[PDB]
Amino acid sequence: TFEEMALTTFMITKESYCKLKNSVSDVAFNRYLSLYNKYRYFSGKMDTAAYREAACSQLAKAMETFNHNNGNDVLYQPPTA
Amino acid sequence: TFEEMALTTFMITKESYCKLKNSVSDVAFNRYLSLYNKYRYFSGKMDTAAYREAACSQLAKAMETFNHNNGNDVLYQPPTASVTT
């Protein structure tokens, strides 16, 4: 699933981007995207439940960039493990 | 392009399906798909514009099947023709 992929390190390619997009509703994707700044600039501790959601944001953001900002592949790594 | 790919033989996979769906507007895709029967049971000779459109409907159909039906990596074969000079 998307939440699960968000926690692993892998390459975002046209193929993997695709499967990830198809695995999450567009509504969920945009909500994750909208939480990016909150986690990119999070002060303090992150309970796992928060880290899971922070990872989804990170992934949604990485996907947005791949798609809306270029034509090239990029390695994805979960937030500060 | 989508039109060009419909005239080639290749495997419809999750990745190829993807590049294909992204290369055509949803509207044009549904249009091609709607013409599948017209060309599938077409009686007679066609000009090149019609042949190209027939190939597109065939590709649109193979993609619909891949996505909505089973979703098993399948080979896409453009339509063959008995050409008359």
Author numbering:
A (entry chain A): 1 to 81
B (entry chain B): 1 to 85
Task: Show passages lifted from the paper.
In particular, the C-terminal hydrophilic region from T408 to Q496 is highly conserved among all the coronaviruses, indicating that nsp4C may play a similar and conserved role in coronavirus replication.
The WT nsp4C monomer contains four α-helices (α1–α4) and two short β-strands (β1–β2). The refined WT model contains two nsp4C molecules in one asymmetric unit, termed A and B respectively. In the WT nsp4C structure, two monomers in one asymmetric unit are linked by a 2.0 Å Cys425-Cys425 disulfide bond to form a dimer. Notably, the N-termini of the two molecules are not aligned in the WT nsp4C dimer. Instead, they are projected in different orientations, with one molecule rotated by about 150° around the y-axis relative to the other molecule. The hydrophobic cavity of WT nsp4C is exposed on the dimer surface, and the C-termini of the two monomers extend in different orientations. We propose that the surface properties of the WT nsp4C dimer are representative of an “open” conformation given that its positive, negative and hydrophobic areas are all exposed. In WT nsp4C, a disulfide bond at Cys425 causes the C-termini of the two monomers to extend in different orientations, and thus resulting in flexibility and undetectable electron density differences at the C-termini of the monomers. Our WT nsp4C crystal was obtained under non-reducing solutions, so it is considerably easier for two nsp4C monomers to form a disulfide bond in the crystal.
